[PDB]
Amino acid sequence: GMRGLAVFISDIRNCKSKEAEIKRINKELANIRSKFKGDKALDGYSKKKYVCKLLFIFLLGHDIDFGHMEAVNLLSSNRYTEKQIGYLFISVLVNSNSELIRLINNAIKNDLASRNPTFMGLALHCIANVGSREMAEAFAGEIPKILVAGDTMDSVKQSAALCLLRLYRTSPDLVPMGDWTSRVVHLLNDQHLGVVTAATSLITTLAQKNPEEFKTSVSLAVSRLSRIVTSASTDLQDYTYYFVPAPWLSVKLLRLLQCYPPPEDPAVRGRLTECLETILNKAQEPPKSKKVQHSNAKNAVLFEAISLIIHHDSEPNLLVRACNQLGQFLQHRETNLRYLALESMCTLASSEFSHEAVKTHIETVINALKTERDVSVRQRAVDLLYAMCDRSNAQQIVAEMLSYLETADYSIREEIVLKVAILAEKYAVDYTWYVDTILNLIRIAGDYVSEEVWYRVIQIVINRDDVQGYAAKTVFEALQAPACHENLVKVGGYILGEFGNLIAGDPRSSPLIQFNLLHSKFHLCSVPTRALLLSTYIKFVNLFPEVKATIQDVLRSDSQLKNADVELQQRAVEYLRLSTVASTDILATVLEEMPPFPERESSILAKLKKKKG
Amino acid sequence: MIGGLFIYNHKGEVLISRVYRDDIGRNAVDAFRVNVIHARQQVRSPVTNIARTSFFHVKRSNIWLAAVTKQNVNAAMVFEFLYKMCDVMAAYFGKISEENIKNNFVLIYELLDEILDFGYPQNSETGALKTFITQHQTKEEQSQITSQVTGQIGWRREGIKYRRNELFLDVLESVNLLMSPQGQVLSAHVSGRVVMKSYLSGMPECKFGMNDKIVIESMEQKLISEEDLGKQSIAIDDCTFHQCVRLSKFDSERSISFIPPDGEFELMRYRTTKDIILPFRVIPLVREVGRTKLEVKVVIKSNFKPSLLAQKIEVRIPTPLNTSGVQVICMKGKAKYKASENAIVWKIKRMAGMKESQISAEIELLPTNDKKKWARPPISMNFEVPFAPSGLKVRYLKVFEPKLNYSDHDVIKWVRYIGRSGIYETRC
Amino acid sequence: SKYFTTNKKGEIFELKAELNNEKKEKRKEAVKKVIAAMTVGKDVSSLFPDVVNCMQTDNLELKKLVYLYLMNYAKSQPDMAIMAVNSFVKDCEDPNPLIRALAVRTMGCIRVDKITEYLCEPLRKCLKDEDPYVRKTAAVCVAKLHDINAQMVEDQGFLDSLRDLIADSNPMVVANAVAALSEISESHPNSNLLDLNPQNINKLLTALNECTEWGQIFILDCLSNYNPKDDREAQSICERVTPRLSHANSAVVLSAVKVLMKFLELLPKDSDYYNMLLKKLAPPLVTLLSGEPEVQYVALRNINLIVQKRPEILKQEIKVFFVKYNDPIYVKLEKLDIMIRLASQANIAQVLAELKEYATEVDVDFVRKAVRAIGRCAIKVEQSAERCVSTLLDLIQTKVNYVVQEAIVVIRDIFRKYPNKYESIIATLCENLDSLDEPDARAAMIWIVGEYAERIDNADELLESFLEGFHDESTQVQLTLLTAIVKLFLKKPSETQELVQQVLSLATQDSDNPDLRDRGYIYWRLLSTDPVTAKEVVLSEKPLISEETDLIEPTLLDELICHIGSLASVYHKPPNAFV
Amino acid sequence: MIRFILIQNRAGKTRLAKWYMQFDDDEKQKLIEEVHAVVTVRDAKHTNFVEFRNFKIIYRRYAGLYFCICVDVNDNNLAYLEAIHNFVEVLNEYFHNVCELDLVFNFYKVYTVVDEMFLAGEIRETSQTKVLKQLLMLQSLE
C-alpha cells in the first residue's frame, strides 16, 4: 500500500557494499526528510511507509529526531496501523519534550476512554515500556479502575495487570492499596486462567509485600490447586499445552504459598499432603507420551512443588521419597537434567533429617565430578556435600577434593580451599592432623591464599595450645623445604619465632643456621612480610640468646639503615636501638608468648558469603 | 622451543593456527582472542603476559599475528622471526591479506614448520627455497638440494647468467633534522642505506669504497669526483650491515667482504649524527597578543645552490585555532590555507636554492592558554629533493666475476643520491 | 590452497561423498575442507579410516597434509596411530632425505613408547646420516623425544651419539645440536652438557663466525653457561665478539652484551679494550633505540637495566631520551625517566622548563610520573628543589588531587631528606585532608603529624576527627597513625593519654594482625614502662636513606644478567616469578 | 522477568532485538556480541539456558536462527523453553515455512505478536489456538 517502504526493503536488502547501503539510506533520507522537511506529509500510505522505515532504521543503528508530534499525528490518524506504529515508535523510541509526553498521556487517556480492547491494550503496553512516572501518577488508581471496577475479559486485563505490575515493581510509591483482596482472590477462583496467571503474578508481588494480607487466599488457593493437579487437561484445551495442567499458574501458586510458612494445618494442609502424594506418585510414571516437553513441564512443576516442600523437612517420609527421586535423578544422560538435580539436591542438602541419606550418594558424587568435565555441576555437588559434610567423610573429602583442586580454575580455587578449610575448622578436632592438612594446602600453592585465612589458622594455633611443639617442628620441616611460599614463610616463620623453642633439642634446631637462612630469604619478599620477620628476628634473641651476637652484627647492615620507607626504617630502629643498646631486661619484659587470641566468629564465613552471589 | 603462532584478522578468528608445542591449549587460544583481541581498554603491548604466559601478538598490519609461548626466550629473536616471516610472505606474493594467505596455505605451513620446528626456528636463507617452495626430485636434484643446504652460501648464489652485468645504486639520505624555532639545529643527523639493484651473472663477491676518516677525497669515474677535503665524510656514526658482509674482515681491517645477491637489496644501512648541510634558514616562531590573538612569524630563507631546484614546496604553518582576524603575508609561491588542521600551507610550486619567502601571520583568538594551553605544532617544510647532503660518496667500488670471464670493466655501475627532508619541523 | 573454511551440517557427509570419489580433485578439495575443520578446531578423526585408505598414495602435498592431520589428531586419538607407524617406516625407506626428514619431524612430533622403538635404530641412522636435514630433524626429534620418557638407556645412547655430534662439521646439524642441548640443559639433573672445553670453545666460536645467526645465538647462550677461569681467555673471547657488531642484531646484540657483562667485571685499566668497548658502546645503543618501536622498547628496558648496573659514559647521550610529540606515551615516559636518571646538571634549567611544559600537557599518568621525578630532582641537587617548591606548589594550586595526591608522598620523602625547611606548606596541607584517597598520601600526612605534632597544636581536633578511620583502612595506615600518636604523646604527653588508651584498646582488641596487636603491647609496655626511656630511642633522629630514587636489588639484577636478552630481564620481573 | 529477547541469524547479526529494560547501545551491543560468541562456541550437549557472568539467558538455537531470551536466576527454565518452542511453532505455522526474507518484510508482525502474548518482561498469553485465532483476525488490522 506504499511503494518507498517495500521497494526500499527490496533494494537495500540487495545492497551489499556498505557504501551502497549508505547511498540507499541517503536516498531514503532525501525522500523522507524533504517529505517532512517540506513536501508536506500525506496521511495513510506515506506516513505508514516512512514511519515504519524510520522505526526500523532507528533499530538499524540510527534514530529519528522528528515526526514524533507527527507520531502523535499517527495516533491521531485513521488507519489502526498508523496509530499502532505510533504506539510502537514512542514505545520503541524513548521520548523527550514533555509536551510530546503530554499529548501522549492525553491520547492514552483517550484510548482508555475508547473502551475498545486494542486501544487500551496498546496504551498499557506503551505505559509499561515507556514507563513515565506521570502514567502511574495519573493512573495510580486509574489502572486499578481498569483491571477492576469493571471486569470483562482476560487478554486486555492481564495486559493491564502486567502494565501495573511493571509500574508497581518500578513505582509502588505511586500505588496506594487500602484493600482489594477479595477481587484478586476470586480471580484465583476464576477458571478463566488468562487473567489468573498474571493475577497470581502481581498478587505474588503484593504478597512479597504483604503475605499476612492474604490468608483468605490460602484455603481457596489450595483447593483450586489441588483441583489443577487433579483436573489436568481434559478441558480448557487451549488452556492446555501438551496436556499439562496450568504449569505456569500452578508454579505461581506454589511459589507464592512458599512464602507462607511450612505445613502446620492438619486438614487444609492435609489436603496439601494429598497433593504432595499426587505429585510424586504421578511424576514417578514413565511417559506414555514420547516428547521431552511433557517431561520438561512435569519436572519443572516437580521442582516447584519440592522446593515448596524444601526447607521444611518436617516430612520424613516425603524427604525419603525426594532422596530416592534425586538418587535416580543423577543418572539422566543430559548434563542439564542431573545438573538441575544437583541444584535441587544441594538446596535440600542441609536436611538434618536426610543428611545421611544424601551422604549415601557420596561416591556417586565423587566419580561423577571426577568423570565430569564440567564445573557448574561440580560446584552444585560441592555445596551439596558441604551442607552435609562431617568429620568422618571429611577425612577422605580432604584427599579427593584436593586431588581435584590441583587442576582447577583460580578464583574458584580460592573460594573452595577457603570453604573447605572452614569446613575443617567446623570439624577440626584432630588439630595435629588438621595442621598437617593445612601444610598440604600451603604446599599445593601457599602463594595465593588471602590474609585472614592464614591469620585464622595462626590464631587457631595460638588458641590450640596442644600441638604447638608438633606444629613448630613441622613448621621447621616445611622450612627446610628448599622451595618458597611467602604465606608459608610468614606463618611458619612467626610460629617458630614464638614456638621454635618447642622444637629445640634437635640438631636442625640451630637458630644460627635457620636465622641466616631466613636472612637469605629476608630481603626477597613483600614489605609486610619484612615486618613480620622483624618481629620474628627480635623474638629470636630473647628466645635463643646463642645467636644474639650474630643477630646484633647483622641487624646493623646499611640495608635496614637505608631501607627507603619510613616504617621499616623505624621498625629496624626500635629493634636495633634496643638490641645494640640493650637494657637486656626490657627484652624479656616486652617479649610475651602472645596469648591465645580472644574469641571471634571467623568472619571468613561472612566474607565468603558476600563473595557468594 | 615455542608453540602456537596464530595469525589473526580484525574479527579475531585465526588466519592461521600454527602450533609448535603440546602445552598449547584451545582453551588458551580462545582466551587470548577474547581478552587481547577483545578488550574494553585499548592501551596494550605487542608482548603480553597472561598468567605467567608470554604473548608476542602483533598487528604488523590490519592483519594481526599472535606468537604464544610459555618459555623464557629472547623476545628480540622472536620478533626478528616474525619480521622475516611477513617480509618473505611479501617477497613471495607482495600484498598479504586473506587470499594471499589462502592461496598460499600449504607453502605457508610447510615453510613455517620448516623455518621453525616445534618452535626451534630454522633459517630462511631462501637460497633456493622459492624454487622448490613453489606456489619430484632427481638424484642430481636430491644431492643438489642436500649440498646447497650443506653449502655455506646463500642469497641466491649458484652461479647465474645475465646477458649484461650492471648494477644501479641509490643512496638515500633521510634528513633527521630538528632546529630551534629561533634558529639552532637541535638535531643534525642523517639516516641512510645502500640499496643495491644489480643485474649480473655468476656469484661475484664485490667490494666498494666510501671515504673514511676524511671528508671525501669503467666509463664514468664520477661527475662530482671526490675533491681533496671534499664533501662531509666522517667516521660513520653507525654503520649497519647485512648477512653478506664479513665483520671479522672489517674489525680486522675496517672492511667486510660482501657476496651480494642479484636484483635489488639493501647492502648496508648507516647513520651519521653530525656534519650535515642545511637547505634553508627558517626562523618559525609564534607570539601572543594578550589573550585575544596569536601571531606567527615565519621567515623562510631557503639556502641551496640556486641551480638546485626543489619543487612542490609545501611548508606547514599551523594557524592559531581561534581565528577572528587573519593577517596574511605573501612573497612567492601560492597562498594555501588548511582548515580542520588550522594551518597556513605556504605551498610553493618550486623553489631554487638560496631563496627566501616570508609569511607573517596574526590570528585573533579567545583566551584558552591556561595551565593547559595551545599546543605549538612544529612548522615543517615538506618538499622534493634528491641530494648527497654529506656527499660522502663512492671512494671506489670493486666488483668482478673472478670465476670465468666478466671482469670489473665488464660491469657497468650506477648510483643515485636522494636526500629526504620531511623532517624539517620546528615551531616550538 | 584457496580457503575452504567450512565444516558443519551434514556437509561431513558431502565430505564423504567427495571422499566417495578416489579421484584427485574431490580428494584434494575434501582435504581442504579437512584443513578448514582442523583450523576452526573441529575434529575429523572419523576420517582416519578414509584418510588412511586414500592415504595409500605417493603425492608430496598429500603426504604433508596427511602428516599434519594424522599427527595433530592422533594427538587426540593415540589408538589408530598403528596406521601411521607403517607409513612412517615406508618413508624412512624413501630415499628422499627431505621427505625422510619430514617423516622424522612429523613422527618425532609424537612420542608415546612404541614409535620410539620403531624409529630408534632408524633414528640412530639419521644420526648415522650424512644429510643435514635428516640428521637435523633427527636432533630436533631427539629434543622432542625429551618431552617425556627422557630417562631411558635407549634415549641415553641417543644422547651419547648426539653428544658426540656436538662435534659436527655440518652447520645445520651442529647448529640445531647446540640449540637442542642448550634447551636440554633445562632438563635439570643440573649436570647437563659435559662437553665444554677450551678447544671446543674456540671451534664453536669459529662456527659462530661462520654459522647462521641461529647457531650464533645458541653458542652465545651456551657461553652464558660456560664459566671461564680468568680474563685472558675472556680477553680473546671479547676479541671474538669484536666482529659481533651489526647483524640480525637485536637478539644477537642482547645476548652478546649478556655474555660480555658476564665477563665485564674487571677494570678498564686491566684492559682498555674494556674501556674501548665502554666508549664504543653508546652509538650501537642508540641504534637499538633507533631501531623499531618494539625492539627500541626492549632496548629501553635493557638500557634502564644497564644504567642500574653500569652508571657510566651514557651520561652524555640523554639526547636519545629527548621526548617528542610523535613519540608514544610510554616511550616518552621511559625517555623522561632515564632523562632524570641521566641528570644533566647543565640542562636541569631547560629540562625543568620542558618538565613543566609536560605538566601542561594532557595526560594524568606521565604528569604524575614527572611530578615524582621533579621531586626526586629536589631530593637531588638543592638548587632545583626551590623551583620544585614553586612548581609543585602551583601544581597543588591546579587543584587536581591525583597529582597532589602522589605529590604528598613525594614531598614527604623530600622533607624526610630535607626536614624543618618549608613547613609553611603544612598549613595549606591542613585544608587538604578532605580529599585523602591515597594510603600513600594519607600516610604522608600522618607522617607529617608524627613529625611535627609538637609544632602542630591544632593536631588535637584533626586527630580526634581522623579517629573516624579505625576500621576499613589498610593496616599500614593504622600503624602510621599509631606511631604518629606515639611520637605525639612523647612530645606532648599532656593530652595524648585518652587518645593512646582508646586507640590501644581498640587496635589490640579489634586486632587481627598479631604484629599490630603485640605492637600495641610494646607501645604500652614501653609507655606504661618508661616513656622517659622511649623518647631516647624514638624522639632522637633517625638517619636518612641517602638518595635511593628507585634503586635495584643487586642480586636480582646480578641474576637477571643471566637473562639480559631473555624475557625475564627485559620484563624486569624474576624468571622464577613466571612459570 | 524477561530481561530482553534477542534473535540472530546464522549470518550473525541479531535479526530481532526485543528488550524489556532501558538497555543501551553499548550494553545491547555487548550483549549481542558476547551471546553470539557463546552460541558459536557452545556445542550440542548444551542446555537452552546459559548464565553470562551474573545471570542467564533462555536461548534457543536453530540451523539459521538463535532465539535468545534473557532472565536472571530463578525462572523455571523448562517452562520458558516450552514457551519459546510454542512461539516458534506459532511463527512458522502462520508464516508458513518462513524464510528470513518474509520477516525482512514482516519483522513488525513477529514483534507485535510477541508484544501480544508476552508483555512487561513476562508471558502475557499462551494459548495456541486462541493465539492463532486472534493473530489472524488481527493480521487484518489496518
Author numbering:
A (entry chain A): 9 to 621
B (entry chain M): 1 to 135, 142 to 223, 236 to 446
C (entry chain B): 4 to 582
D (entry chain S): 1 to 142
Quote the study on this structure:
Clathrin-mediated endocytosis (CME) is a vital multistep process in all eukaryotes in which plasma membrane cargo proteins are first concentrated into a patch by clathrin adaptors, which are themselves clustered by interaction with a polymeric clathrin scaffold. The most abundant clathrin adaptor is the 300-kDa heterotetrameric adaptor protein 2 (AP2) complex, consisting of α, β2, μ2, and σ2 subunits. AP2 plays a central role in CME through binding plasma membrane phosphatidylinositol 4,5-bisphosphate [PtdIns(4,5)P2], the two most common cargo motifs (YxxΦ and [ED]xxxL[LI]), clathrin, and other regulatory/accessory proteins [reviewed in (1)]. Here, we used cryo–electron microscopy, tomography, and subtomogram averaging to determine structures, interactions, and arrangements of clathrin and AP2 at the key steps of coat assembly, from AP2 in solution to membrane-assembled clathrin-coated vesicles (CCVs).
We assembled both AP2 and clathrin onto YxxΦ cargo/PtdIns(4,5)P2-containing membranes. Inclusion of an additional “dileucine” [ED]xxxL[LI]-containing cargo resulted in tilting of α, and movement of β2 away from σ2 to further expose its [ED]xxxL[LI]-binding site. Helices 2 and 5 in σ2 are poorly resolved, and the proposed β2 N-terminal PdIns(4,5)P2-binding site now contacts the membrane as does a region in the vicinity of helices 2 and 3 of μ2. In vesicles and buds with both [ED]xxxL[LI] and YxxΦ cargoes, the dimeric form of AP2 is absent, likely because the N-terminal helix of β2 has moved to contact the membrane and can no longer contribute to dimerization interface. The transitions from cytosolic to single-cargo membrane-bound AP2, and from single- to double-cargo membrane-bound AP2, involve conformational flexing of the α and β2 solenoids. The AP2 distribution was unchanged by the addition of clathrin and, hence, by the formation of buds and vesicles. We did not observe a regular packing arrangement of AP2 in our assembled vesicles, excluding the possibility that clathrin organizes AP2 into a lattice, and also excluding AP2 oligomerization as an essential step in membrane curvature generation.
